[PDB]
């Protein structure tokens, strides 16, 4: 993730919790894909609606 | 009035030591 400057690779010290980093529920990390091209998902589709906050729901 | 006497048993709250508990049917 982050580190080096005097280091090499792979964590240690105080955790930033959020169960399994890059947790589904809202992700800007990687693009989605809706079920069979039907726009129903209980989560974000990877759209920028949280760049400036606002949820949505059709 | 318009009809509203549809009210609770006219109990009072149950007696306790330390403000609260539950006694059920006792």
């Amino acid at each position: 993730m982050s580190g080096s400057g005097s280091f090499e690779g792979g964590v240690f010290s105080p955790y930033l919790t959020g169960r399994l980093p890059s947790w589904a529920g809202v992700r800007q990390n990687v693009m989605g894909s809706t079920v069979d091209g039907r726009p129903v998902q209980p989560a974000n589709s990877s759209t920028l609606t949280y760049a400036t906050l606002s949820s949505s729901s059709v | 009035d318009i009809n509203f006497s549809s009210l609770a048993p006219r109990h009072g709250t149950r007696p306790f030591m330390g403000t609260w508990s539950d006694i059920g049917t006792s």
């Binding site: - | 318009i2 009809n3 509203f4 549809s6 403000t19 609260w20 508990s21 539950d22």
Partner: protein
Amino acid sequence: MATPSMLPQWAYMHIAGQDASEYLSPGLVQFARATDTYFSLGNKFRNPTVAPTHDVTTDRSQRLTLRFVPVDREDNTYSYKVRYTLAVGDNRVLDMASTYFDIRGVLDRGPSFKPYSGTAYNSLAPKGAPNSSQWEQKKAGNGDTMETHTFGVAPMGGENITIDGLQIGTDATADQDKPIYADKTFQPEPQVGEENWQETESFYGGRALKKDTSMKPCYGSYARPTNVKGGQAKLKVGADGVPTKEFDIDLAFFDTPGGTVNGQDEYKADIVMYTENTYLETPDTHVVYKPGKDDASSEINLVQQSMPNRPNYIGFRDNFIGLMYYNSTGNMGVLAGQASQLNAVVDLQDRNTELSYQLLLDSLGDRTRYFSMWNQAVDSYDPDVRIIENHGVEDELPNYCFPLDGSGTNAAYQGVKVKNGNDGDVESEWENDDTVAARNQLCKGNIFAMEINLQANLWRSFLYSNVALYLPDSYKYTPANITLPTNTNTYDYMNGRVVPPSLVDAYINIGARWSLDPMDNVNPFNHHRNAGLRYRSMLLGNGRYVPFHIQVPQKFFAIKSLLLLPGSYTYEWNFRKDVNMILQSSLGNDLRTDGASISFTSINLYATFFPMAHNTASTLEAMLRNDTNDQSFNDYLSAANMLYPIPANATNVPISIPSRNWAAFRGWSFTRLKTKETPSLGSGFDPYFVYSGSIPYLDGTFYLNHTFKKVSITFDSSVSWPGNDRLLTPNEFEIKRTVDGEGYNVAQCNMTKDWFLVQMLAHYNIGYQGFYVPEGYKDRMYSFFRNFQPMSRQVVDEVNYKDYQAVTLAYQHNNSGFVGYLAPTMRQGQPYPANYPYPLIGKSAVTSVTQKKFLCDRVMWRIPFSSNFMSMGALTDLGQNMLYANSAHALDMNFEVDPMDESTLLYVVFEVFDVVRVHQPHRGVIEAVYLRTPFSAGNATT
């Protein structure tokens, strides 16, 4: 520290001990009581409070929420039927308070919808402004040659005009500086002009519309972008149709006339315009005047006027009124056993569950707190709409506009200085300065300005839009340039009709508090200032097409607060898909015609279970399976509900009830409705219901209680009930007395002392020991006191004023030269004396009459069936004289009402007991018995 722990040190610090007054020394306990009212010691001693640790919650896996999917559903053509199997497990107790439907679907609102009262496109524009548009005409043309005349404005400067139009940009050195010419598509933007009030001179370029685009005034004009650069040009029609890569944009060049002016042989451009064809529209405005008869492009279609369309707010009713069939035939709900299959719900047609539930939540919280869950938001009006309080405007300072440079009109001035003084304005001898420039811009006298009375036109505007538009259509006229729908319940007809602004102006009923006379019979919950309706509308969104999700509660009184014990049960309910019935409008136009549509996909049932311990849940299950622990409820408005016609322009309603037992009878209530505003229940569809405004019948939002002038009661056909000499009119009640000569009127209006007494004993319950304002909880939204509004005004005495001339609307003038002639259009006329309102104040006041009335809105009149007209018990004293002196008697009631120019109904409520009583004797078995006393079903059949 924090080192102590466990129970002995939790009773030491009073986290889990005995209360103070058990651990305190008993001298300090009595000292505290002794000194309590002037030196409290209560806040100095901590009292423990422990939750119960066992036999109040299960440790078993149990859900606190369950979603029952339908077991069968069928959609009809205007109903939706949804069955469920509602199961309650063993050792689970369910409350039916916490059950609610989840309904989702798509809602469409017609093009009548407009949740705003302005215009969203332009709006700072004059309403006469026409855009930049050219037209073709023969102004001296002939044959196929048409003169092309352009009206417009070119706002941004240039440097040159050539064959590539405006040249405004310049390229840097790379082989000299190259001109950069403005792009056809968007570059001479209409939002960019000069940034100074000092001219940029030179050349100018702009935009224009084709003559292929029809003229529409600039005010609500809109054309969608066709580029991502906000060009509005439409693509050229090529070989392959409208799709092409070309845009329909041309260049038209112009110069100032004269041969001396510009070249002698040249006529180089000075102005250039990027003419283009666009998708012009008016999405929210309508043309309120034009001289023409055809909309096209013409010199006379520059002159057009525009006004925004009427605000129309659409959204689900107050508590989802009319979204379920209650009190209906063949659309009755079901709650039943699963094995038994016998229905334990009976819905009668003389019940009004929907109205009843309004009155319940009157009394069980405030209705001024909105809740978005069950969609609570009560219909209301602003009381500066319904009763016009007027006081003129404070406008004692003139307000002005000034030019941008703020120095008015300036002219040339050269400098001068004396050659050597000698005194004189020409005799001291003056001569030109060469160190002071010629052509200085100085303004002699005061700077240019134009007066506007802002305050005056801020209350002119408001008063027109909240009152004048909501006048009846007997004061309106159709413009002389447009045609409207034949149907009068269309939105298009309603916003197309024009009302003179002179009918209600800020110069009549001035200094009075007084609802207008034509506004006493207009429903005042059909306006855009209804803030319950506005809330509901904007809780769905701002567009026509609204996918929705709503949570809708049960309201039927029998099972509303029932605790349903273990067992499996069939629950089934029907939902209306009738747009009129489920959507309130702020104009009350017929939404079926307009184009509203609704449909449901996915209806489910929720339940919420307290997670009771299994031991404690089965002790309570056993106890409520006893036959002496039967659960009993009543309808809040426990009544027989009946309607009786009133013919058009009729003055009396003859009401007669057959011989009936009156054992356990309570009062009566009554209110007047309109036939068209009242839907017929007992039908799956009423095809003649063309209304969709606030339904008074179900919403409890009455407003015609002030048209009653008497009522009279007779029992046995020979005995007047208010005839034991208990009233000043000793054989009837009079509500209004108009022509008073015994001083029976009270409270500074036309309402008798007799009736004022009666309606203060039926509510406040005091009037025999002086009248006082009722307490805060004795009056509520639908209580009498809050909605009683006496009012008065003087008007000219038309017989005892000897200079009284009856001038009509046409021949009234006031604001002559500063307001349009009987239309919301531009000013017309000359400054001249007014002649409209007659003085009633100051010297030269005219002789006057006094007019007095009251309004009661949201109140049903009620007369208790008690000898003293106050009830000190729900089962009245005369309800218990019908257990010894009853055998059935006739009741005949006579009523006198004001004439109405439309058909009306009288709603007489006969107040009863509606006992809904229910028992479970075994698991999955439910039983009930429903009984009512003075009016009851099953009283002539089994």
